[PDB]
Design a protein around this ligand. Structure first.
Ligand code: UDP
Ligand code: UDP
Ligand code: MN
Ligand code: MN
Lengths: 313, 311
């Protein structure tokens, strides 16, 4: 049956105790705490941070990043469970509307097979709170609807999902890194989302909103050699970009593999459709890796090589 | 719907007149002047300066401080307007590129809901920047070209979301960064127009003034239910960080941080303090009196245990 996961910082034993007491009052015994990534203690050299290494600096805020890692890690776990078991993921500061246990039960019973991602709470646009009280607050049907995308102002504090949604989110990140705050990431991912009527949970004490310090990434070893690419350390081809992803070489290499139009990627996280002549590559210093540089597809270079060597120079 | 605000010193009536004539020439008929904080007349004892009272002394330069206060006050106003109305904030020495009114209109029409902070001009640190900033005729909105940025809050479009974020940043940090770079370093997502719509000894009420405000000592009238104040005492080290010598700001930071057990009025918030009998003497520098606030919950825990002991 339903697995409940509560994302909780080890240090927030206050929040943990509150949640445990809430579950007791609801007679819910089937839950577990996920030990949340503490943004404060994330190590600058930890390779898991690769997903955040790009030009959207807001994602490097310690609390923002820790939160993102926590949901993402939970998704990896859920993604692995292809049994189809349902998970309810909660944050550790939520409130239950009265008769939570009964209401959740009714909602669960109503779920159809295609409803893989369901918000049972969300932040509603301030301007839309009044006009959506009928569907979100006052409703007594306990039914599941397409997400009201026009009303959405964030929230992964209460959602029911299975491996299908989790795997999709995980896949999205493998092609994008984490360039969007984690709740908006699900919203922008293109995965179909649903909602309960009414909402079952709702949410000021915050380990995120007042932390503006960013993780300062340590330079980490570049131990990556690939059969299909030549690596040129400390050189780049400015421009000719498809897009920026994130400074994570395995992620980048895979993206480059899958894209016929991609001829090169740099370790800063740019995947490129055009590069300059090699003699026109510019110098780039180590920012993320020892060494940073550019990977170029061998097939591209081999074509050039054959032709250039044939020429009467 | 766009509200235009021009930051202008009351004394710079010359700049004001120029701007008004510029608006006329551009057929912009609605705008208002914000009365800029004159750094020259900021009172040493004015409590508003608490945000500048720290070790980054460059922020205490009279013009720098006045400018910072002006944008910050404008942000407070905008932050209050949660209707989502767009504001265009200008400094009072800018030039409009030809066909400003029409071009602005085109830019406004392209705005997406997440684009809360948009530079329509900035100081650029040349082929690429001329093409995107000067020659471009698309009138579209892009992520800020962070690599090209060399400052500027002389022309920006924002709503309450950007303003409130900046305001919040300052409530947790004071103003330890020149105000333009503050937005840039704040972590808020910033955008830019292609092209830019506006552009800027050189006439300046900031860049020639190196004299700093010398802060007067002001009364410490602050008593808090959750803290005991010990005047003219400090606990050396055990610091999280220095913020600024502003007691209300500090108290709020201390409230919100479970690891914080004390703060001094010099602007240091602390995670560890010595035994009380090992507190050191510190003189009045910002407040009468300077000293240390210690959380009562911390001391009450000690008190219970110490009183239980066979002494
Ligand atoms: O460094 C952090 C801070 C928070 N969180 C988790 O993110 C959720 C929201 O945290 P909080 O309530 O502090 O933030 P807010 O709701 O204000 O964004 C909770 O489940 C936390 O355990 C996390 O994983 N790492
Ligand atoms: O004491 C001062 C000096 C300037 N400013 C404002 O800051 C902006 C930039 O000032 P100025 O052009 O003199 O400075 P610069 O561009 O040389 O830094 C203008 O809107 C001024 O009204 C202010 O608020 N207080
Ligand atoms: Mn929360
Ligand atoms: Mn100027």
């Amino acid at each position: 049956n339903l697995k409940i996961i509560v994302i909780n910082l080890k240090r927030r034993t206050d929040r943990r105790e509150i949640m445990e007491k809430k579950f007791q009052d609801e007679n819910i015994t089937q839950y577990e705490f996920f030990e949340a990534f503490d943004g404060e203690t994330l190590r600058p050299e930890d390779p898991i941070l690769g997903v955040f290494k790009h030009g959207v600096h807001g994602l490097s805020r310690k609390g923002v990043a820790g939160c993102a890692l926590s949901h993402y890690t939970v998704w990896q776990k859920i993604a692995a469970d292809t049994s189809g078991t349902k998970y309810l993921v909660l944050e550790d500061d939520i409130n239950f509307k009265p008769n939570f246990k009964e209401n959740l039960s009714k909602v669960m019973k109503t779920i159809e097979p295609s409803q893989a991602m369901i918000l049972i709470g969300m932040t509603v646009n301030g301007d839309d709170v009044t006009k959506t009280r009928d569907i979100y607050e006052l409703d007594t049907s306990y039914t599941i609807h397409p997400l009201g995308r026009d009303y959405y102002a964030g929230g992964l504090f209460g959602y029911i999902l299975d491996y299908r949604a989790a795997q999709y989110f995980v896949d999205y990140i493998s092609y994008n890194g984490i360039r969007i705050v984690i709740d908006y990431l699900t919203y922008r991912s293109g995965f179909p989302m649903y909602e309960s009527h009414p909402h079952l949970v709702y949410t000021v004490d915050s380990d995120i909103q007042h932390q503006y310090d960013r993780i300062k990434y340590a330079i980490i070893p570049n131990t990556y050699e690939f059969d299909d690419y030549v690596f040129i350390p400390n050189k780049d081809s400015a421009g000719g970009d498809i897009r920026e992803v994130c400074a994570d070489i395995p992620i980048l290499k895979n993206i480059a593999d899958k894209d016929i139009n991609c001829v090169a990627f740099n370790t800063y996280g740019w995947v490129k459709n055009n590069i300059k002549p090699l003699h026109q590559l510019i110098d780039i210093g180590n920012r993320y890796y020892e060494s940073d540089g550019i990977y170029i597809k061998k097939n591209y270079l081999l074509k050039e090589k054959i032709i250039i060597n044939s020429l009467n120079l």
